[PDB]
């Protein structure tokens, strides 16, 4: 029997994972379920620890929910580890999407100077739970949702001795939702070869029953977002809703400014929806369907099952531009050993430059990551093709840097 550790209990969508596993039960003996958290958390962790109490008893499905502040408990003898963790919380991505608006350039979570320091303050914590595992759990998996998930999963396979990592991604399932509706099929009938980064993923290939649609799919997409038809239809491949960072950034830039000065920006709007929803927590959608992929996964693993689906790991020149050491997301055969990359051969020229650029950004922000190395950072923020500059990288970096102090151990030794 299973017991599963979850860092990042206090979070929003921690009752879609309990849920999850309470779908798939008869295929995942989960015998103990435990949620752990922070100090600064507990609250948010007591809440949804209830809830998902009240579900599974409700349900008639016997996890056993734990609560602690205390992962070393948690992580002894797990067979799975998942992380769902915010190191700063949502004030601390605020600062991510505020401070680089100032200089005219994209503030994202994943994306851009917010990307870099979601990785800088993530990875360090990562580590250390790589560090607890290596003792407590040296058998178990660590499946990774927490962001920059594709930088995340490049830094513990070059710096770390953990071979068993998977990254999840929530772009693939909804862009196979989206087409389907586009054909207006159910989406069971619907296949696509993924290939790429976290949110940095194409549509290679659109099957319809397993008949190719592609060519068909794209004329659906630029007709019935916002692309330029012709760049579509040139482009012969479906991009992610991320890529209109880098092929639509003036749009993007637009509709932060817009967000900032009027709903707030997305974490503000995040704050406010999860404050009136620990409130519905209190007694007896979209967003993200994360811990539904992550369910997936963890039963196709456990059960050896061999189906298809796409998730960050380690390449082995499934991609042949991309370093068979460096994290991709592309279609895996989920094994019990673990993810099988498909061979795709590489991306086509059209799109193998952008993904390279992006991959030079994860590995040199990865490195920056563990390093603490300022040198190295600023080289990560001047190569990010949404910063227009080596002088206004060195500003948004030294801003940011004082402006997560707190969050960044390996930049700032200090107080506490």
Known sequence: RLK????????????????????????????????????????????????????????????????????????????????????????????????????????????????????????????????????????????????????????????????????????????????????????????????????????????????????????LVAHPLGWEPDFLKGLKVLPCPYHRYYFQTDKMLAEELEAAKTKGTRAEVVQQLEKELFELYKDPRGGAYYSDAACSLISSIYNDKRDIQPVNTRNNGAIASISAESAVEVNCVITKDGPKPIAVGDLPVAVRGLVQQIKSFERVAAEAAVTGDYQTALVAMTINPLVPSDTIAKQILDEMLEAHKEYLPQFFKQAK
């Open 4 to 219: 599963i550790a979850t860092i990042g209990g206090g979070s929003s969508y921690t009752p879609e994972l309990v849920e999850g596993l309470i779908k798939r039960y008869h295929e995942l003996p989960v015998g103990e379920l435990w949620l752990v958290d922070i100090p600064e958390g507990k609250e948010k962790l007591e809440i949804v620890g209830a809830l998902a109490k009240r579900m599974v008893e409700k349900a008639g499905v016997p996890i056993e929910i734990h609560l602690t502040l205390d992962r070393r408990r948690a992580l002894d003898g797990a067979d799975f580890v998942t992380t769902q963790f915010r190191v700063g919380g949502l004030e601390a991505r605020a600062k991510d999407e505020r401070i680089p608006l100032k200089y005219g350039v994209i503030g994202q979570e994943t994306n851009g100077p917010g990307g870099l320091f979601k990785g800088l303050r993530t990875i360090p914590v990562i580590l250390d739970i790589i560090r607890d595992m290596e003792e407590l759990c040296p058998d178990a998996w660590l499946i990774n949702f927490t962001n920059p998930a594709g930088m995340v999963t490049e830094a513990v396979l070059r710096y770390t001795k953990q071979e068993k990592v998977v990254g999840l991604c929530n772009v693939p399932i909804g862009m196979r939702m989206g087409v389907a509706k586009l054909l207006g099929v159910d989406a069971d009938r619907v296949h696509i070869d993924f290939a790429g980064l976290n949110h940095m993923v194409f549509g290679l290939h659109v099957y319809l029953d397993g008949v190719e649609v592609t060519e068909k799919v794209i004329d």
